[PDB]
Symmetry: D2
């Protein structure tokens, strides 16, 4: 968790979050995804072809991840397997089409990280210019 | 709380926090303060000459704020008043020397916010240059 | 021409030039061009399919532009036409292959301008951090 | 002199000059100076208590430097000495009041260089954001 910052540094940290979040939402909206869905698909790529238990996905990223995964399952992007010896546990793995989607997203996401860094630096420079010029 | 970011945006948000936190710690260390002590003194200035209940200070910023305030009381920077009708409640107000300390800190803190913004923008530009040049 | 700057602003202006120049040289070297050759080809595109007199090219950008254009002519990127009534005058126009080369250069050059702006802003922020921290 | 840049890099170099020049003009106007007068006073400080020939001042920075120096002489900031053996040569040295003026200008000029660097980096980041977002 975030320990005490001055109010001004704390508002700047939130502005950093808000700017980054908005740029990701705009790029992920084009693929009908959220960043949490991208983060699930990336996590499943790190163990592909093996699956991961729904609870372990939530722990590495909980009840909102089942609806999230339902959307990914309906799109054929992930495959669910109920553990035959423990029917409450659902393991989820990436499919070929989830791998393809992540390969198609590599360039848009890298550009999205470049736009984040650019806008963050401009926002910070606007505040720096303001502080230098009130002094 | 901070909703899902990509891992990369999440690490950048933590780098923003770490950089800002370190610059404040270095300037506040010179006055033998923490940022949470500065934040308490600023909060008490907004109601000066009135005091604020220890619980309301914690709520606006809890058991760690009493040791924090003890240090400020020992330095003569704040004045405690136990409520005569409710002895468990301790109201804390700024003193003249706490007001003076905040006036002496206005310039160092503004420079500290300028150094934060500068370093944040450079750190972000280093990552942007790296991403543009791997592509 | 550049009127009086402080020595420090003058050295910074030269650092701006040196950084921009080096990034262009590296991208144009890959197509076996110089920036002055790119600038000639762009100038000839603005009047294509008409040609421009060698002297007017030099004026809009003089004896070093004939060797420069010789290289472009040998590569089939420009076409020379000696004026039949005035044999000293050589009009130069872009060819289809010079147009194609400029279309292939649009993306690399835009990225080159993005890397220039990025590096310029980082170099300036390094000097700003240095000045704020000597004070 | 500045060798071939792309048109876009050349306009950016001029924007760098224009921004830096305007910030200096605004700070130097407050002391009723130009940057060329500041540059003369700094040059005379490097040889103080010795003077420098008017022609050597012009060479290190020519007929416009005599009016420039006249203003500095009228303000008691420099002292002229006509060479007794060569009456055409006028050596100019800093006075105590020219040294004092340069000591009073150290902080405003350093802040002026910080505002230049800040504004340059913001201007460049605005253009970088624009280029990344047209792509």
């Amino acid at each position: 968790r975030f320990d005490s910052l001055t109010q001004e540094a704390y508002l700047q940290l939130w502005r950093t979050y808000d700017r980054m979040k908005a740029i990701e939402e705009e790029i992920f909206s084009q693929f009908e995804l959220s960043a949490q869905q991208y983060n699930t698909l990336r996590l499943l790529r790190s163990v592909h072809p093996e699956g991961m238990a729904t609870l372990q996905i939530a722990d590495r990223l909980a009840p909102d991840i089942t609806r999230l995964i339902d959307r990914l399952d309906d799109r054929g992007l992930v495959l669910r397997t109920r553990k035959p010896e423990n029917r409450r546990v659902v393991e989820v793995a990436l499919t070929d089409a989830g791998l393809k989607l992540l390969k198609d997203l590599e360039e848009p996401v890298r550009q999205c990280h470049e736009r984040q860094l650019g806008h963050l630096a401009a926002d910070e420079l606007h505040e720096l210019i303001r502080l230098m010029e009130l002094a």
